[PDB]
Each structure stands twice: as C-alpha cells, then as structure tokens.
Amino acid sequence: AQYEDGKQYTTLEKPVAGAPQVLEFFSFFCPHCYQFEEVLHISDNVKKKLPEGVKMTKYHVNFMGGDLGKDLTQAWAVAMALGVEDKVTVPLFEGVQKTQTIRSASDIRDVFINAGIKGEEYDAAWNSFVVKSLVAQQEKAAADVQLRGVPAMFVNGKYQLNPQGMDTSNMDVFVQQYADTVKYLSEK
Numbered sequence: 001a002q003y004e005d006g007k008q009y010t011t012l013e014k015p016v017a018g019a020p021q022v023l024e025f026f027s028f029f030c031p032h033c034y035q036f037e038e039v040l041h042i043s044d045n046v047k048k049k050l051p052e053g054v055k056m057t058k059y060h061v062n063f064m065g066g067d068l069g070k071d072l073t074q075a076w077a078v079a080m081a082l083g084v085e086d087k088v089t090v091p092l093f094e095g096v097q098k099t100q101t102i103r104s105a106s107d108i109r110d111v112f113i114n115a116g117i118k119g120e121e122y123d124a125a126w127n128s129f130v131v132k133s134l135v136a137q138q139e140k141a142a143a144d145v146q147l148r149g150v151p152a153m154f155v156n157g158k159y160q161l162n163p164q165g166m167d168t169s170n171m172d173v174f175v176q177q178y179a180d181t182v183k184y185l186s187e188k
Contacts (some may be wrong), residue, residue: 012157015158016145018157019154021054021150022056022057022182022186023058024057024154025059025060025147026058027063027064027065028092029096038093039171042094046153051186057141059137059142062142066144067135068105075092079112089115156186159188161182
C-alpha cells in the first residue's frame, strides 16, 4: 500500500483507550522539537489538514533536562491553564536552546512576565491544584504509551508517527507527508 505500518507510522501493540485524537509530546530541551516548532511548524500544518471535529493536544515530558525538565512540564501546565501556549512556546525554546538564558524556575517565570502574564496570575497558577492535575495528565499520557522519545505524535491512542521513514531533502515536502499521514491515520 502507500501507507505501510512500519513505514510512515507504527502501530502500538497495546492501544490506549480514551486517548486524545491527536496527541503530541515534546520537551523544550529536545532539538528536533525546536525544529518542529520554529522551522517546520508541524502542529500547525497538521491542524490545517485535520478534519472537522478533531481536537489537538500537546504535552511536555519530564525525561529530558532533569530538575529543569520537570519545572518546564509544570510551566507548560500553567501555559495550558491560562491559554498562553502561543505566547511562551517560542521564548521558552529560545531561552533553553538558543540563548541558554533559562536555568531556573525563576528564569522560566521571567519568560511569562515578559510575554505579559502578570506575576501574581502566574504564581497563583503555578501553585494551583488545577495545574497539579494538568501535570498529572501530562505524565499519565506519556506513561500510557511508554514514551522514551520526543518529538512524538499519536493518533487515537493507536498509531505513532514515524518521521524517520519520510524524505527530508525538502523541508516542505517532509511537513506535508507528515501532515497527510496524520490525516490518513485520522480517517483510519
């Protein structure tokens, strides 16, 4: 066929009931994730090709960057709760991997302040139990699929994208193949 299991995707031998339709995992420490966000804009091109009625989820992971990796997962929980993902994603990525100006939870916090979230609002969120359960959700979704690598995308708790098996000579062609694959898997 044109889309082969083991080629543009793999099937999980244990599928995850009740999983989000399109579920993406990343880390702000993850070099391909930086590309995915800043250069390729994967999430956005996937969205543009997804059906109607399908929602998109993106979660941070703990297994890169030790203590700071965990702070970033909680910070991402704050971002999701406040709905400010689109304002902090790029400065968090650049602060970790480009400028290397993010070294502590306070430096993460500075990124939100600079993006205009008020100190009080951020700190209340950070400490909130809505943010605690949001962190729990991120952890459980990764645990549900025995996640050991990022970037990763899962469709319907059953299929895992396999970008290693797609042409990378042209970045645009790669992104469309990726997105067209998510769409195919979505309709599966």
